[PDB]
Short mmCIF file of C-alpha atoms and ligand atoms in Angstrom, two decimals:
data_model
loop_
_atom_site.label_atom_id
_atom_site.label_comp_id
_atom_site.label_asym_id
_atom_site.label_seq_id
_atom_site.Cartn_x
_atom_site.Cartn_y
_atom_site.Cartn_z
CA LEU M 462 171.83 -60.81 -80.80
CA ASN M 463 174.58 -63.45 -80.43
CA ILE M 464 172.50 -65.66 -78.15
CA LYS M 465 169.31 -65.13 -80.20
CA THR M 466 171.01 -66.09 -83.48
CA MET M 467 173.00 -69.02 -82.01
CA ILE M 468 173.27 -72.15 -84.15
CA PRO M 469 173.50 -75.06 -81.67
CA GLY M 470 176.33 -77.56 -82.01
CA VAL M 471 175.18 -81.08 -82.84
CA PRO M 472 176.08 -83.92 -80.44
CA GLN M 473 178.46 -86.61 -81.68
CA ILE M 474 176.47 -89.74 -82.62
CA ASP M 475 178.09 -93.19 -82.54
CA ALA M 476 176.45 -94.59 -85.69
CA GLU M 477 176.96 -94.83 -89.45
CA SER M 478 174.05 -92.52 -90.29
CA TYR M 479 171.28 -90.59 -88.59
CA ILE M 480 168.59 -88.01 -89.06
CA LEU M 481 166.39 -85.99 -86.75
CA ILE M 482 163.18 -84.49 -88.15
CA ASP M 483 160.11 -82.67 -86.93
CA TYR M 484 157.01 -84.77 -87.63
CA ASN M 485 154.70 -81.81 -88.26
CA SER M 486 156.89 -79.49 -90.29
CA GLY M 487 159.23 -82.07 -91.87
CA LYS M 488 162.17 -79.83 -90.94
CA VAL M 489 165.48 -81.68 -90.76
CA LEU M 490 167.11 -80.63 -87.48
CA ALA M 491 170.32 -82.65 -87.82
CA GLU M 492 171.65 -85.27 -90.20
CA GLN M 493 174.72 -87.29 -91.11
CA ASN M 494 174.97 -89.62 -94.10
CA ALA M 495 171.17 -89.58 -94.14
CA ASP M 496 170.89 -90.69 -97.77
CA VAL M 497 173.50 -93.46 -97.70
CA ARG M 498 171.94 -96.80 -98.62
CA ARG M 499 172.16 -99.33 -95.83
CA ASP M 500 170.70 -102.65 -94.74
CA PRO M 501 167.43 -101.77 -93.00
CA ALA M 502 167.13 -105.14 -91.24
CA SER M 503 163.96 -105.21 -89.05
CA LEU M 504 163.15 -101.58 -89.84
CA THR M 505 161.65 -103.11 -93.03
CA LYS M 506 158.75 -104.11 -90.76
CA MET M 507 157.74 -100.47 -90.49
CA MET M 508 156.69 -100.67 -94.15
CA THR M 509 155.04 -104.06 -93.55
CA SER M 510 153.01 -102.40 -90.79
CA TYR M 511 152.25 -99.40 -93.04
CA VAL M 512 150.77 -101.68 -95.71
CA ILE M 513 148.74 -103.60 -93.13
CA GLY M 514 147.61 -100.30 -91.65
CA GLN M 515 146.44 -99.08 -95.07
CA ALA M 516 144.52 -102.31 -95.67
CA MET M 517 142.79 -101.99 -92.31
CA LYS M 518 142.01 -98.32 -92.89
CA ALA M 519 140.43 -99.42 -96.19
CA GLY M 520 138.27 -102.01 -94.36
CA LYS M 521 139.90 -105.04 -96.02
CA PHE M 522 139.99 -106.83 -92.67
CA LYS M 523 139.72 -105.99 -88.97
CA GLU M 524 141.69 -106.78 -85.83
CA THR M 525 139.26 -109.51 -84.70
CA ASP M 526 139.51 -111.49 -87.96
CA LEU M 527 141.22 -114.89 -87.70
CA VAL M 528 144.21 -115.72 -89.90
CA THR M 529 144.83 -119.40 -90.52
CA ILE M 530 148.58 -120.01 -90.48
CA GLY M 531 150.16 -121.74 -93.51
CA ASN M 532 153.42 -123.60 -94.03
CA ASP M 533 155.42 -120.50 -95.04
CA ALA M 534 154.74 -118.84 -91.65
CA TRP M 535 155.69 -121.97 -89.69
CA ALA M 536 158.57 -120.76 -87.50
CA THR M 537 160.34 -124.09 -87.02
CA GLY M 538 159.49 -125.24 -90.55
CA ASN M 539 161.65 -122.73 -92.44
CA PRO M 540 165.41 -122.50 -91.59
CA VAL M 541 165.48 -118.98 -93.12
CA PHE M 542 164.06 -117.99 -89.71
CA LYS M 543 167.05 -119.44 -87.78
CA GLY M 544 168.20 -117.14 -84.96
CA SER M 545 165.65 -114.47 -85.81
CA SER M 546 162.78 -112.90 -83.91
CA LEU M 547 159.70 -115.14 -84.02
CA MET M 548 156.18 -115.39 -82.73
CA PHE M 549 156.43 -119.24 -83.08
CA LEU M 550 153.47 -119.84 -85.35
CA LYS M 551 152.54 -123.33 -86.53
CA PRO M 552 150.32 -124.32 -89.48
CA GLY M 553 146.64 -124.65 -88.61
CA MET M 554 146.76 -122.07 -85.84
CA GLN M 555 143.97 -119.52 -86.12
CA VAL M 556 145.34 -116.23 -84.85
CA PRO M 557 143.52 -112.87 -84.63
CA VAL M 558 144.96 -110.07 -86.78
CA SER M 559 145.34 -108.08 -83.51
CA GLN M 560 147.80 -110.67 -82.21
CA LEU M 561 149.79 -111.01 -85.43
CA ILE M 562 150.25 -107.25 -85.78
CA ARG M 563 151.51 -107.04 -82.18
CA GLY M 564 153.85 -109.93 -83.03
CA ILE M 565 155.12 -107.75 -85.87
CA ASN M 566 155.19 -104.39 -84.08
CA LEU M 567 156.33 -105.35 -80.57
CA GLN M 568 158.27 -108.57 -81.13
CA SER M 569 159.47 -108.09 -84.74
CA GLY M 570 158.14 -111.60 -85.51
CA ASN M 571 159.34 -112.67 -88.95
CA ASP M 572 156.81 -115.49 -89.12
CA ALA M 573 153.96 -113.09 -88.28
CA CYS M 574 155.03 -110.91 -91.24
CA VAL M 575 154.67 -113.87 -93.60
CA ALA M 576 151.27 -114.80 -92.15
CA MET M 577 149.96 -111.23 -92.56
CA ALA M 578 151.50 -110.80 -96.02
CA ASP M 579 149.66 -113.84 -97.36
CA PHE M 580 146.44 -112.86 -95.58
CA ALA M 581 146.50 -109.28 -96.86
CA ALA M 582 147.94 -109.72 -100.35
CA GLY M 583 147.83 -113.44 -101.26
CA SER M 584 151.60 -113.93 -101.56
CA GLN M 585 154.79 -112.51 -100.13
CA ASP M 586 155.82 -111.27 -103.59
CA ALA M 587 152.50 -109.41 -104.04
CA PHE M 588 152.86 -107.88 -100.58
CA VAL M 589 156.42 -106.74 -101.35
CA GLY M 590 154.97 -105.19 -104.52
CA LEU M 591 152.67 -103.14 -102.27
CA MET M 592 155.59 -102.14 -100.03
CA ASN M 593 157.51 -100.84 -103.05
CA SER M 594 154.41 -99.10 -104.44
CA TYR M 595 154.25 -97.11 -101.19
CA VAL M 596 158.01 -96.42 -101.45
CA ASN M 597 157.11 -94.69 -104.75
CA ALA M 598 154.01 -92.92 -103.38
CA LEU M 599 156.02 -91.51 -100.45
CA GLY M 600 158.73 -90.24 -102.84
CA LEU M 601 161.51 -92.20 -101.11
CA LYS M 602 164.69 -91.99 -103.16
CA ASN M 603 166.91 -94.57 -101.46
CA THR M 604 164.66 -97.48 -100.47
CA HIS M 605 163.81 -100.83 -102.01
CA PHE M 606 162.32 -103.93 -100.39
CA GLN M 607 162.62 -107.59 -101.39
CA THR M 608 161.16 -109.27 -98.26
CA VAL M 609 158.17 -108.81 -95.93
CA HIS M 610 160.37 -109.00 -92.80
CA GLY M 611 163.94 -108.00 -93.73
CA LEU M 612 165.40 -111.54 -94.05
CA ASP M 613 166.96 -113.11 -97.17
CA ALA M 614 167.14 -109.86 -99.19
CA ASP M 615 170.52 -109.13 -100.85
CA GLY M 616 169.14 -106.20 -102.89
CA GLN M 617 167.10 -104.56 -100.15
CA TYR M 618 168.15 -101.16 -98.79
CA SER M 619 166.97 -97.98 -97.14
CA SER M 620 168.45 -94.89 -95.52
CA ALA M 621 168.14 -92.86 -92.34
CA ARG M 622 166.08 -90.19 -94.10
CA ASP M 623 163.80 -92.71 -95.78
CA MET M 624 163.21 -94.62 -92.55
CA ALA M 625 162.34 -91.40 -90.71
CA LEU M 626 159.93 -90.60 -93.57
CA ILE M 627 158.27 -94.03 -93.27
CA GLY M 628 157.93 -93.34 -89.52
CA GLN M 629 156.32 -90.01 -90.36
CA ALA M 630 153.92 -91.75 -92.79
CA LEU M 631 152.91 -94.33 -90.15
CA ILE M 632 151.97 -91.65 -87.65
CA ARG M 633 150.27 -89.45 -90.25
CA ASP M 634 148.42 -91.92 -92.50
CA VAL M 635 147.68 -94.95 -90.30
CA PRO M 636 147.29 -93.59 -86.75
CA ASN M 637 145.39 -96.69 -85.53
CA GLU M 638 148.36 -98.84 -86.54
CA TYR M 639 150.84 -96.39 -85.03
CA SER M 640 149.06 -96.45 -81.65
CA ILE M 641 150.16 -100.10 -81.17
CA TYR M 642 153.86 -99.22 -81.03
CA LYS M 643 153.72 -97.76 -77.48
CA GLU M 644 152.34 -101.01 -76.05
CA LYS M 645 154.90 -102.43 -73.66
CA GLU M 646 153.80 -106.06 -73.83
CA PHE M 647 151.31 -108.53 -75.26
CA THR M 648 150.61 -112.20 -74.56
CA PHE M 649 150.53 -114.98 -77.17
CA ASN M 650 150.05 -118.71 -76.58
CA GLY M 651 150.38 -118.24 -72.80
CA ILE M 652 153.69 -116.35 -73.04
CA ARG M 653 154.15 -112.63 -72.31
CA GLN M 654 156.26 -110.82 -74.92
CA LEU M 655 157.86 -107.44 -74.29
CA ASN M 656 158.21 -104.61 -76.78
CA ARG M 657 161.83 -104.51 -78.03
CA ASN M 658 161.90 -100.69 -77.93
CA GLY M 659 163.56 -100.05 -74.54
CA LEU M 660 163.04 -96.28 -74.84
CA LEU M 661 159.34 -96.79 -74.04
CA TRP M 662 160.44 -97.20 -70.41
CA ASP M 663 162.62 -94.08 -70.28
CA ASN M 664 160.82 -91.66 -67.86
CA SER M 665 162.76 -88.60 -69.10
CA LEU M 666 161.10 -88.72 -72.53
CA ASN M 667 157.68 -89.49 -73.95
CA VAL M 668 158.78 -92.04 -76.55
CA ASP M 669 155.84 -93.89 -78.19
CA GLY M 670 157.56 -95.60 -81.16
CA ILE M 671 158.72 -96.94 -83.42
CA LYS M 672 160.98 -99.86 -84.35
CA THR M 673 164.31 -101.45 -83.53
CA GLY M 674 166.46 -103.69 -85.70
CA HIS M 675 169.67 -105.63 -85.30
CA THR M 676 171.54 -107.98 -87.54
CA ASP M 677 175.31 -108.48 -87.45
CA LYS M 678 175.27 -107.05 -90.99
CA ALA M 679 173.14 -103.91 -90.31
CA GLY M 680 174.45 -103.10 -86.82
CA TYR M 681 171.99 -101.54 -84.37
CA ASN M 682 169.10 -99.63 -85.90
CA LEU M 683 166.34 -97.60 -84.30
CA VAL M 684 163.56 -95.31 -85.48
CA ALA M 685 162.19 -93.45 -82.47
CA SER M 686 159.49 -90.86 -82.03
CA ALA M 687 158.83 -88.75 -78.98
CA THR M 688 156.66 -85.80 -77.99
CA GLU M 689 156.91 -82.77 -75.75
CA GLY M 690 153.96 -80.35 -75.71
CA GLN M 691 152.93 -79.47 -79.29
CA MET M 692 156.08 -81.02 -80.62
CA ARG M 693 156.83 -84.44 -82.09
CA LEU M 694 160.28 -85.52 -83.26
CA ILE M 695 161.36 -88.58 -85.23
CA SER M 696 164.94 -89.88 -85.14
CA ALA M 697 166.45 -92.62 -87.25
CA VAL M 698 169.85 -94.00 -86.28
CA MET M 699 171.35 -96.67 -88.51
CA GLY M 700 174.42 -98.81 -87.96
CA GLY M 701 174.72 -97.98 -84.28
CA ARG M 702 178.14 -99.32 -83.36
CA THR M 703 177.71 -100.51 -79.75
CA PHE M 704 175.16 -102.35 -77.63
CA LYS M 705 175.46 -99.65 -74.96
CA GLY M 706 174.48 -96.93 -77.46
CA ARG M 707 171.50 -98.70 -79.03
CA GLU M 708 169.03 -96.43 -77.26
CA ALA M 709 171.43 -93.85 -75.85
CA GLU M 710 172.43 -92.33 -79.21
CA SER M 711 168.79 -91.79 -80.21
CA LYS M 712 168.02 -90.33 -76.78
CA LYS M 713 170.90 -87.85 -77.35
CA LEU M 714 169.31 -86.65 -80.60
CA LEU M 715 165.77 -86.40 -79.29
CA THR M 716 166.73 -84.54 -76.10
CA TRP M 717 168.93 -82.16 -78.12
CA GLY M 718 166.08 -81.44 -80.54
CA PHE M 719 163.57 -80.60 -77.81
CA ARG M 720 166.06 -78.36 -76.03
CA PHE M 721 167.00 -76.24 -79.04
CA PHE M 722 163.96 -76.27 -81.29
CA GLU M 723 160.23 -75.56 -81.09
CA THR M 724 157.37 -76.17 -83.53
CA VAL M 725 154.80 -73.47 -84.17
CA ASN M 726 151.45 -73.59 -85.97
CA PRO M 727 150.84 -70.01 -87.17
CA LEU M 728 147.99 -70.75 -89.61
CA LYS M 729 145.31 -73.40 -90.12
CA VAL M 730 143.47 -74.36 -93.34
CA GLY M 731 140.45 -72.19 -94.05
CA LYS M 732 141.38 -69.26 -91.79
CA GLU M 733 141.96 -65.86 -93.41
CA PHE M 734 145.59 -64.69 -93.51
CA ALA M 735 145.05 -61.86 -95.99
CA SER M 736 142.39 -60.19 -98.09
CA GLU M 737 142.69 -58.64 -101.55
CA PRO M 738 140.31 -56.81 -103.86
CA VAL M 739 138.88 -58.90 -106.70
CA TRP M 740 137.55 -57.79 -110.10
CA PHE M 741 134.54 -59.21 -111.98
CA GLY M 742 133.35 -61.30 -108.99
CA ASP M 743 130.23 -61.94 -106.90
CA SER M 744 132.22 -60.51 -103.96
CA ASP M 745 134.43 -57.39 -103.70
CA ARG M 746 137.25 -59.22 -101.91
CA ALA M 747 139.07 -62.55 -101.88
CA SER M 748 139.80 -64.27 -98.58
CA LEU M 749 143.30 -65.75 -98.71
CA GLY M 750 145.14 -68.37 -96.67
CA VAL M 751 146.45 -71.93 -96.98
CA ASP M 752 145.12 -75.34 -98.07
CA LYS M 753 147.31 -77.25 -95.60
CA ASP M 754 148.07 -76.41 -91.95
CA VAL M 755 151.34 -74.52 -91.53
CA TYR M 756 153.91 -75.96 -89.13
CA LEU M 757 157.34 -74.37 -88.76
CA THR M 758 160.32 -75.55 -86.73
CA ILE M 759 162.37 -72.66 -85.36
CA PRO M 760 164.98 -72.15 -82.64
CA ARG M 761 163.42 -72.53 -79.19
CA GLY M 762 162.49 -69.13 -77.78
CA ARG M 763 162.13 -67.38 -81.16
CA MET M 764 158.34 -67.75 -81.50
CA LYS M 765 157.69 -64.16 -80.38
CA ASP M 766 160.09 -62.93 -83.10
CA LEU M 767 158.36 -64.69 -86.01
CA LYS M 768 156.98 -62.31 -88.64
CA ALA M 769 154.71 -63.16 -91.58
CA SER M 770 153.99 -61.33 -94.83
CA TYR M 771 153.03 -62.18 -98.39
CA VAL M 772 153.62 -61.57 -102.07
CA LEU M 773 151.14 -61.88 -104.94
CA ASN M 774 151.84 -63.61 -108.23
CA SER M 775 149.75 -61.20 -110.32
CA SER M 776 149.04 -57.47 -110.15
CA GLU M 777 145.23 -57.93 -110.01
CA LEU M 778 142.92 -60.77 -108.98
CA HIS M 779 140.23 -61.52 -111.60
CA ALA M 780 137.19 -63.74 -111.02
CA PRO M 781 136.45 -66.54 -111.43
CA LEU M 782 138.69 -67.67 -108.56
CA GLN M 783 138.57 -71.35 -107.62
CA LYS M 784 138.75 -72.59 -104.02
CA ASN M 785 142.44 -73.26 -103.27
CA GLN M 786 143.70 -71.42 -106.35
CA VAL M 787 147.31 -70.34 -105.73
CA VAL M 788 147.69 -66.56 -105.92
CA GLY M 789 150.90 -65.86 -104.02
CA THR M 790 153.34 -66.95 -101.33
CA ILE M 791 153.38 -66.46 -97.57
CA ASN M 792 156.84 -65.61 -96.21
CA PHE M 793 157.66 -66.39 -92.57
CA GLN M 794 160.67 -64.43 -91.29
CA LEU M 795 163.14 -64.31 -88.42
CA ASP M 796 165.69 -61.49 -88.01
CA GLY M 797 164.48 -59.94 -91.30
CA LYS M 798 165.14 -63.08 -93.38
CA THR M 799 162.58 -65.47 -94.88
CA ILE M 800 163.02 -68.86 -93.22
CA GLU M 801 159.87 -70.59 -94.58
CA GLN M 802 157.49 -70.13 -97.54
CA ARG M 803 153.99 -71.56 -98.05
CA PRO M 804 151.50 -71.13 -100.95
CA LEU M 805 148.84 -68.42 -100.52
CA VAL M 806 145.50 -69.67 -101.85
CA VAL M 807 141.88 -68.50 -102.27
CA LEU M 808 139.81 -69.83 -99.32
CA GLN M 809 136.24 -69.37 -100.61
CA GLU M 810 135.37 -69.61 -104.33
CA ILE M 811 134.56 -66.37 -106.16
CA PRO M 812 132.61 -66.96 -109.35
CA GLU M 813 132.01 -64.21 -111.93
CA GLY M 814 129.33 -61.69 -110.91
CA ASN M 815 125.69 -62.59 -111.52
CA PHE M 816 123.14 -59.82 -111.00
C1 IM2 R 2234 165.47 -107.29 -87.15
O1 IM2 R 2234 166.35 -106.46 -87.31
C2 IM2 R 2234 165.74 -108.68 -86.65
C3 IM2 R 2234 164.91 -109.67 -87.49
C4 IM2 R 2234 165.23 -109.58 -88.99
O2 IM2 R 2234 165.14 -111.02 -87.06
C5 IM2 R 2234 165.31 -108.72 -85.18
C6 IM2 R 2234 166.20 -109.63 -84.32
C7 IM2 R 2234 166.54 -108.74 -83.15
S1 IM2 R 2234 167.31 -109.31 -81.79
C8 IM2 R 2234 167.68 -111.03 -81.96
C9 IM2 R 2234 166.40 -111.85 -81.83
N1 IM2 R 2234 166.79 -113.22 -82.14
C10 IM2 R 2234 166.89 -114.04 -81.24
N2 IM2 R 2234 166.80 -114.84 -80.33
C11 IM2 R 2234 166.15 -107.49 -83.36
C12 IM2 R 2234 166.28 -106.31 -82.49
O3 IM2 R 2234 165.93 -105.19 -82.95
O4 IM2 R 2234 166.73 -106.42 -81.32
N3 IM2 R 2234 165.57 -107.41 -84.56
#
């Protein structure tokens, strides 16, 4: 019992805040100061990429389309860019979207962000409006953007939790955009540029994202995501305190998560979990399940011990029953205790009887 019910100790993490979540279940595996508002620095570009990804998903433009660079995206024409990561765009260049988005995602090019913001939304301010609209849509409680890149934004902030949630949204909602993050290099204007995410080259993990950020003000920041088998984790580490820990602290969290936790998928949408009699219907019985795939994160090795059962909201089911009508709750249990609950819904509509 003692070894089965063990709660693992969390490694010490040399950073101001962090969080470790499961991508599929959303379970928070470990956290410290995860809601404290901090300078996001280049992590802001995750939201820039999310907006671009949404626009591309919507067919607003495609990767082959040429963007004509304007004055505001001219790297050496705007001292706000001094000492920052740049693609080195000049006005009059005609650059494919594919190249600009790799400038953003791999190189953290601040100039590329401006070029894409104007192309996608007409102005930087309108683009930032979109970024903040998605902050609202994603339910983020501790995030606000002022810039398309992270620079020159005194009232901009995010948090470890919110940055992990933006990472989750990238992978979930804009998978074609997310797929770019694992690319180790791209070439622009005859120069090869390497992805800044050093973890991509760590053989011991399968890291395929997401974004790094450093300013002297924000410290060292990293949102990472890695997979092992069925399982995908996302870590966000903000205000990393040393150069030597910039990838090491995140690696500590990810490796710890895979060692102690596992993700299970006990039920898919549309598959019967339970059946109940129904009154007044065109069928004698209601087929019951979920309207969203169930993922649970549990201690590693406890999968065989997982039990499921359900409760019903009402004594009797009466037709008409709508598809996806909520009629109860599924309880998932370990060691006799409910650890997770999901809504139990009608899978196939049952109208009133017609004879
Ligand atoms: C993001 O956090 C900044 C961006 C706002 O400029 C970039 C800069 C760097 S490293 C320094 C590059 N400048 C210099 N020659 C990073 C990084 O994550 O390493 N992010």
